[PDB]
Amino acid sequence: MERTFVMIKPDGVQRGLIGEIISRFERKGLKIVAMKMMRISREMAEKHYAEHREKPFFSALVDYITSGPVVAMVLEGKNAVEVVRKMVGATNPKEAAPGTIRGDFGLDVGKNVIHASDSPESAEREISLFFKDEELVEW
Amino acid sequence: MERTFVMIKPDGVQRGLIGEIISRFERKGLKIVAMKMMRISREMAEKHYAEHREKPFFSALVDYITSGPVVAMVLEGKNAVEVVRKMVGATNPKEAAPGTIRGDFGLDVGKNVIHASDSPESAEREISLFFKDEELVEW
Amino acid sequence: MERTFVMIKPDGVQRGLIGEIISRFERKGLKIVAMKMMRISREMAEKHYAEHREKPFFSALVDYITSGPVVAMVLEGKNAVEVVRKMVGATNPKEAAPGTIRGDFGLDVGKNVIHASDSPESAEREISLFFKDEELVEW
Amino acid sequence: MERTFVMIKPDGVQRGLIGEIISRFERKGLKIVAMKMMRISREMAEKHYAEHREKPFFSALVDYITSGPVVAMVLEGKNAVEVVRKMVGATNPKEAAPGTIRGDFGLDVGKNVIHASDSPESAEREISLFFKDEELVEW
Amino acid sequence: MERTFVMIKPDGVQRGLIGEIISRFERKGLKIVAMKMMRISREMAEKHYAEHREKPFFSALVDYITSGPVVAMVLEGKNAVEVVRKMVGATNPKEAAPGTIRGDFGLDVGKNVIHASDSPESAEREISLFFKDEELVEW
Amino acid sequence: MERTFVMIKPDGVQRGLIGEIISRFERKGLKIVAMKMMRISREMAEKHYAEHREKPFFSALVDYITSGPVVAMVLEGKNAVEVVRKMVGATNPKEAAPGTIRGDFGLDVGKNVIHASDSPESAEREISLFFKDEELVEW
C-alpha cells in the first residue's frame, strides 16, 4: 500500500508537538509502520537537502535540522503521499491554511515544524535514506 | 535527570493512542530521549517478563506483547520513574484512577495499553534490554 | 458483556457537553449499544427516582431532569457498571475527583451533568424503563 | 429555524468518532434536536441511496451502510444545511480540506465517515425517512 | 516585532471559549504581551466601530459589544497581523473555512466570536485605544 | 458567589499553558471576573509571600514569580475556593493527582505552573493585592 515519509523537525520536538502531530495522522486512519527519534548527522542533512546546497540559507538550514532530535516516520494508507502533504500544508506557514499542521503550529519558513515527502519517488528515496529495511514493521 | 522506560503496547498502537499518550508526557515536561516502533520477539518478551515465568498464564503475557508493533521509549525528567508510574496508573484499568492513562484508556489487565518501569533498577534493566546506547539522544 | 445506563442531564445537553462525555466513553473502549435524545415526562422521572419520593426536595430532583432534553444511553464493556460509575465520579461535583466527568464539569449536586447506574440491578431497571428492546443494537 | 440531517456512518461509529463529531457541532453553536443510534435496514438503505442504484458500487454501498450501527441526528441553526456541509467537507476525503470532518478523519470515498443533507429539500426528505415526528425535541 | 490586537467578544466569553482561542494562538507560537478582561464603555464602543455609525445595525452592534465582558489582547510574532487574520477567518462565519476560529465557533455575522486588527495601522490604533502603554509586558 | 484568586506562573505562561488552564476553568462552569497579564515587582511578590519571609529560600520563591509575566485572575462560582484548589492539586506536582493542573503539567515545587488561594480569607487578601476594584467585572 502507498507509503510516505515524515519528519518532525527539531522545533516540533523541542516545542512538545510530537503527540499532537502523531494524533492527527492516527485520527486520519493512517498506519505508522516505522518510527523513531534520531539525531540527523550533518552528512545525512546535506544529502537530504542537496537540492538547496547553493542557496545562501543552506548552512543555516543544516544547522537547524541537526540542532536537536527529530522524529522520523513512515506512514501507510490510501493516497498517503498526497494526503499527508495536504495535511501538512504550504511550506511557508504564513500561507498554510488553518487546520493544516503548519497552519496551526508554524510561523517561520525555515523552522516549519515538519516535513513530508513531496512525491512517491521522494518517499522511496527519503525512506531508504533514513531507515534500514528492518525498521519497517507490518500490521 | 532520571530516566524511565515506557512501552506503548500493541493494543495502544492498534487503537490509535500513540499521540495522546505522547502529548500527555510532553505536557508534563518529560523529554523523549529515545523512541522507536518495533515488534518484540518472543525471546525478548520472555526476558522482559523473566520474573513472571513461573506464574499463571505466563505465555499469555508474552502473547499480548508480541501480537503487534509496540512503541518503545525512554523519558527523562525530574522524578521520571515515579511521575510516569503515577501517570500510567494501576495495572488493572478498572482500579486505575480517572486521569491516568490506564484509567482513561485501558480495557482490562491484559489489554492495558502501556507499560512503565516500576523502579529505577527496573528502568536501567528495561532500557538496556530495548535500546543500544547509540539510540539514546542528548537534548 | 456488562451493560450500564447513562443519562446526560439537561444541563449537560444545554452546556454543549454531549461529545466530550461521549469521547470519554469511546476512548475508554466502551460500546454505545443504544442512544437517543429525549424529553422525560414527569411521570417517568418520578418512576426513575421512586426510591427518593419520601426524601427532601423530591419534586426538585424531578424538575432538574424534566427541564430540558437529555441524552439517554446504554454502554457495554468489561466492568461497565463500575468503570462508568468511577468515570462519572461522586454525586457532589465538588467532592468528585478531577479527571471524572462530574469533577471536571459539574456545578453542584443538582447541576451534576450526568447520571450512571449504580449497580447491575439498577442498570437492568433503568435500561428497561428508558428503552424498548428493539432500540438496542448488537455490534 | 433551519434544520439539517446528519448521519455518522458505521466506520465513524466503529472507529470511536461519535464524540469528536458531535463536539464539533456543539462548539459550532448548533442545536441537536433529535438524535439516536440505529441500525439501518437494507430497505431503508436502498431507499436512501436510490439515486445510485444502477451504479456498480451500489450493493457494496448498501452492505457498508447496513454493516453496523449509525448515529442519526437532526441539527438546527442559522444556515444549518450549508454550514454543516462545509463542516463535513468534500465527499472524497482525499479532496476534503484539513479542518473538515472528512478531511481530518476519512480516507476512502465510500467509507467517508459521515453524511450531511446536501440541500434543504434533501433535509426534509432525509429527516422524514429516518425520524418519526415525535423523536424531535424542542429547546 | 510585529504586533496585532485581538478581542474575544462577549459571545466568546459567555460561551466559555477563552481558553480554546488562547490555546490556538499559543500553539501557533505567538506571544501574548498584553491581555485583560474588560467591560467596553459605549463611548469606547462607538469610537472603535465609528466606521459603521450610519449603518442600520450600529446600535445593535454597540449593544452587543457592551453587553458583557470581553478579553482584549496583544499578540506578537512574525507576520502577526496577517497570520492572526487568517486564523480568525472571514467576518461572516458562514463563509469562514473550518479550522478557522470563526469557522469552527461562529454562526452569526454580528456575533462572530472574535475580532482581529485588519491592518498594521489598525493594530496601532486599536492597541492605543484599548491599552495604556504600561499594560504591555516584554518576554 | 464565592470568588478565588489564581495566578498562572511565569513557567505556565512561558510554556504556552494559559488556554489549557483557562479551558479547564471554563469547562468547570467557573466565571472569570477579572484577568490580566502582568509582571509582578519584587516588592509585590514579597508582600504576597510575606508569611514565607523567615523560611528557607524565601528569595528563590520570589525569584520564581518575578522572572517573567504571569496571568492574574479572579474566578467566581459555587465553592470556588475549594473547587479551584482541588483542580490545581498538591503543591508538589509529583504528589499532585493526575487530572489536576499541577499533576498533569507541573515539573517540581518551584516550577509548579499555577497558584490558587488556599482559603476564602487568603482569596480576599490576594484579590485586593492584585486588583483595584474597578478591574472587577459583573457578569
Side-chain angles (χ1 to χ4, degrees), chain A residues 15 94 98 103-107, chain E residues 27-29 79 82 86 99:
Chain A
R15 291 162 62 205
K94 104 170 163 62
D104 296 343
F105 305 129
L107 289 160
Chain E
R27 233 118 54 162
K28 183 56 158 186
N79 304 115
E82 176 183 355
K86 290 170 65 52

Side-chain angles (χ1 to χ4, degrees), chain D residues 12-32:
Chain D
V13 168
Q14 166 55 238
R15 291 162 62 205
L17 301 171
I18 305 154
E20 263 140 322
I21 288 168
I22 283 185
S23 275
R24 293 185 168 202
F25 299 141
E26 287 185 293
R27 233 118 54 162
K28 183 56 158 186
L30 300 157
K31 281 162 65 303
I32 300 163

Side-chain angles (χ1 to χ4, degrees), chain D residues 14-99:
Chain D
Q14 166 55 238
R15 291 162 62 205
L17 301 171
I18 305 154
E20 263 140 322
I21 288 168
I22 283 185
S23 275
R24 293 185 168 202
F25 299 141
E26 287 185 293
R27 233 118 54 162
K28 183 56 158 186
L30 300 157
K31 281 162 65 303
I32 300 163
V33 295
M35 165 166 69
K36 68 179 151 153
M37 164 168 290
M38 61 186 301
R39 184 91 189 214
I40 297 159
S41 83
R42 289 177 66 87
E43 162 172 32
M44 182 163 27
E46 278 170 15
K47 274 188 58 190
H48 172 55
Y49 283 124
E51 173 208 351
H52 304 305
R53 73 183 180 293
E54 291 299 353
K55 258 106 92 157
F57 58 81
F58 188 61
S59 31
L61 168 55
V62 335
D63 298 324
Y64 150 72
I65 243 298
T66 51
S67 59
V70 302
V71 180
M73 67 185 87
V74 183
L75 295 173
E76 207 181 73
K78 198 152 157 208
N79 304 115
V81 167
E82 176 183 355
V83 149
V84 174
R85 67 201 281 272
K86 290 170 65 52
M87 294 183 66
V88 153
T91 321
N92 186 328
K94 104 170 163 62
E95 284 164 354

Side-chain angles (χ1 to χ4, degrees), chain B residues 24 26-30 78-79 82-83 86-87 98-100, chain F residues 15 20 93-96 98-99 102-108:
Chain B
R24 288 187 182 211
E26 289 177 299
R27 254 77 215 104
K28 190 61 174 182
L30 300 162
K78 273 145 156 39
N79 305 287
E82 201 61 80
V83 159
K86 290 170 37 59
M87 304 172 55
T100 63
Chain F
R15 294 163 55 201
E20 280 157 283
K94 158 211 163 55
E95 301 304 335
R102 284 170 177 159
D104 292 354
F105 301 128
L107 303 190
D108 70 46

Side-chain angles (χ1 to χ4, degrees), chain E residues 15-132:
Chain E
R15 291 162 62 205
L17 301 171
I18 305 154
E20 263 140 322
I21 288 168
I22 283 185
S23 275
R24 293 185 168 202
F25 299 141
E26 287 185 293
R27 233 118 54 162
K28 183 56 158 186
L30 300 157
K31 281 162 65 303
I32 300 163
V33 295
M35 165 166 69
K36 68 179 151 153
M37 164 168 290
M38 61 186 301
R39 184 91 189 214
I40 297 159
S41 83
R42 289 177 66 87
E43 162 172 32
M44 182 163 27
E46 278 170 15
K47 274 188 58 190
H48 172 55
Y49 283 124
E51 173 208 351
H52 304 305
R53 73 183 180 293
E54 291 299 353
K55 258 106 92 157
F57 58 81
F58 188 61
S59 31
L61 168 55
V62 335
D63 298 324
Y64 150 72
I65 243 298
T66 51
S67 59
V70 302
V71 180
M73 67 185 87
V74 183
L75 295 173
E76 207 181 73
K78 198 152 157 208
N79 304 115
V81 167
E82 176 183 355
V83 149
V84 174
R85 67 201 281 272
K86 290 170 65 52
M87 294 183 66
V88 153
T91 321
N92 186 328
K94 104 170 163 62
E95 284 164 354
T100 67
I101 288 162
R102 288 187 181 137
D104 296 343
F105 305 129
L107 289 160
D108 314 282
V109 41
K111 298 170 137 86
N112 60 349
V113 185
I114 192 170
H115 161 81
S117 298
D118 71 4
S119 72
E121 168 274 316
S122 264
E124 293 171 50
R125 162 181 68 69
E126 280 168 12
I127 291 157
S128 257
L129 182 57
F130 296 86
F131 288 98
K132 295 233 213 36

Side-chain angles (χ1 to χ4, degrees), chain A residues 4-138:
Chain A
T4 195
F5 173 85
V6 164
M7 178 191 77
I8 308 169
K9 296 173 165 174
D11 53 331
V13 168
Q14 166 55 238
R15 291 162 62 205
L17 301 171
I18 305 154
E20 263 140 322
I21 288 168
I22 283 185
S23 275
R24 293 185 168 202
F25 299 141
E26 287 185 293
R27 233 118 54 162
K28 183 56 158 186
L30 300 157
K31 281 162 65 303
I32 300 163
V33 295
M35 165 166 69
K36 68 179 151 153
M37 164 168 290
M38 61 186 301
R39 184 91 189 214
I40 297 159
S41 83
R42 289 177 66 87
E43 162 172 32
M44 182 163 27
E46 278 170 15
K47 274 188 58 190
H48 172 55
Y49 283 124
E51 173 208 351
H52 304 305
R53 73 183 180 293
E54 291 299 353
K55 258 106 92 157
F57 58 81
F58 188 61
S59 31
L61 168 55
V62 335
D63 298 324
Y64 150 72
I65 243 298
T66 51
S67 59
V70 302
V71 180
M73 67 185 87
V74 183
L75 295 173
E76 207 181 73
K78 198 152 157 208
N79 304 115
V81 167
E82 176 183 355
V83 149
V84 174
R85 67 201 281 272
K86 290 170 65 52
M87 294 183 66
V88 153
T91 321
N92 186 328
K94 104 170 163 62
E95 284 164 354
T100 67
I101 288 162
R102 288 187 181 137
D104 296 343
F105 305 129
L107 289 160
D108 314 282
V109 41
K111 298 170 137 86
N112 60 349
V113 185
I114 192 170
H115 161 81
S117 298
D118 71 4
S119 72
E121 168 274 316
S122 264
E124 293 171 50
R125 162 181 68 69
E126 280 168 12
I127 291 157
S128 257
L129 182 57
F130 296 86
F131 288 98
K132 295 233 213 36
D133 309 319
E134 334 100 26
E135 306 186 321
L136 277 286
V137 313
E138 284 190 339

Side-chain angles (χ1 to χ4, degrees), chain B:
Chain B
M1 288 174 283
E2 199 157 282
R3 271 163 183 181
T4 190
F5 174 81
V6 162
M7 177 197 302
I8 310 180
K9 288 177 177 184
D11 55 319
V13 169
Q14 155 78 207
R15 294 163 55 201
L17 300 167
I18 299 158
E20 280 157 283
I21 292 173
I22 286 181
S23 297
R24 288 187 182 211
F25 301 142
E26 289 177 299
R27 254 77 215 104
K28 190 61 174 182
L30 300 162
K31 284 180 181 177
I32 299 157
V33 291
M35 176 163 71
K36 44 179 187 194
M37 162 170 300
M38 59 181 306
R39 178 60 176 263
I40 307 173
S41 73
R42 284 203 79 85
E43 166 158 307
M44 183 180 3
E46 282 170 13
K47 212 177 265 104
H48 175 65
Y49 287 135
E51 94 217 47
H52 302 290
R53 182 173 294 265
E54 242 62 55
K55 297 188 195 143
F57 301 102
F58 173 65
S59 82
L61 295 182
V62 338
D63 288 358
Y64 301 134
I65 66 159
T66 53
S67 61
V70 294
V71 175
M73 74 190 69
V74 180
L75 291 168
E76 182 179 288
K78 273 145 156 39
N79 305 287
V81 166
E82 201 61 80
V83 159
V84 178
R85 252 191 97 175
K86 290 170 37 59
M87 304 172 55
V88 336
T91 312
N92 186 316
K94 158 211 163 55
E95 301 304 335
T100 63
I101 297 172
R102 284 170 177 159
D104 292 354
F105 301 128
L107 303 190
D108 70 46
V109 170
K111 300 307 194 193
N112 71 351
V113 174
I114 193 163
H115 156 95
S117 303
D118 67 16
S119 61
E121 97 157 17
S122 297
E124 174 170 71
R125 181 226 316 140
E126 273 164 19
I127 292 166
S128 316
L129 217 223
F130 289 88
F131 290 101
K132 250 271 121 302
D133 324 284
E134 59 269 352
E135 303 174 332
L136 264 82
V137 189
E138 330 292 274
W139 67 288

